[PDB]
Amino acid sequence: NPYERGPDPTESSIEAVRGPFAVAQTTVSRLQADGFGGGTIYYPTDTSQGTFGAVAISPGFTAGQESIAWLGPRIASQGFVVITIDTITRLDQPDSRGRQLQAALDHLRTNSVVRNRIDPNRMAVMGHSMGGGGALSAAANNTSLEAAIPLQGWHTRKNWSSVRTPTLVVGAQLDTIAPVSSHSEAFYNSLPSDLDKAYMELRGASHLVSNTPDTTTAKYSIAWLKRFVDDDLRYEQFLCPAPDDFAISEYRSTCPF
Ligand SMILES: O=C(O)c1ccc(C(=O)NCCO)cc1
Numbered sequence: 001n002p003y004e005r006g007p008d009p010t011e012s013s014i015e016a017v018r019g020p021f022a023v024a025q026t027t028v029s030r031l032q033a034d035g036f037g038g039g040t041i042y043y044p045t046d047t048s049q050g051t052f053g054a055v056a057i058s059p060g061f062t063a064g065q066e067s068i069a070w071l072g073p074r075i076a077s078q079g080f081v082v083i084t085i086d087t088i089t090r091l092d093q094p095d096s097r098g099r100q101l102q103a104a105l106d107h108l109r110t111n112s113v114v115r116n117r118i119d120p121n122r123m124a125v126m127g128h129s130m131g132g133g134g135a136l137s138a139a140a141n142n143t144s145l146e147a148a149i150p151l152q153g154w155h156t157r158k159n160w161s162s163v164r165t166p167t168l169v170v171g172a173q174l175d176t177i178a179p180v181s182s183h184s185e186a187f188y189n190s191l192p193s194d195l196d197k198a199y200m201e202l203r204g205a206s207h208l209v210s211n212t213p214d215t216t217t218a219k220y221s222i223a224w225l226k227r228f229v230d231d232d233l234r235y236e237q238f239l240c241p242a243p244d245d246f247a248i249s250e251y252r253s254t255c256p257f
Contacts, residue, residue: 035103
């Protein structure tokens, strides 16, 4: 694997708030962002290993970038360029959120600080609440995205037959805002049966789980990004088969990948 980055993984390594790569940050202003409300980019200083796949992350309704700020450094430390985006408006809907994510990854192709540190062919999308719905729309409008991860996703749309990108759907058990039955689960089973996919329910968690460091959320997001953005077969061990939980009330996948 030429995109393999970093030492072989451990259940501790993927659970670390910061992984191996030391990371730096650039702030995109609301003014210098075409199609989004700006954002904060996280990237590994180490270019010795090669270029890094990109990931865009959106917040949810009414929420600023702070909602999802913990995820940018935590994923980029493992070998990725991550943009934590603030929406054009706090009342932005999931479909716009899908546009603002393609806009944010596109911006990464021209950002001066991270143009040479990125691999423009291997990209992925992620979002919390409506942010997760966005992540789902950008995948359906682009069959080149290498991965997609909805987190307590919220959306009006449920059919996801078009989706052709490896998708990890994440739900919280006690969610009263975006119920799993009407959303997350509804999105996984609408996805292509033959694609590479997985659904994971988190135990005891409310809808606001992704708005605070959650180790279960981070480790599996980092394993999906590694298996599909870096084609890393070293991280398939953390997804196939299902793992011990305590935090996972439910899991279903299309293993083996
Ligand atoms: O899609 C959302 O995230 C969302 C869903 C329902 C509410 C709500 O119950 N509020 C109604 C009056 O404000 C808020 C946000």
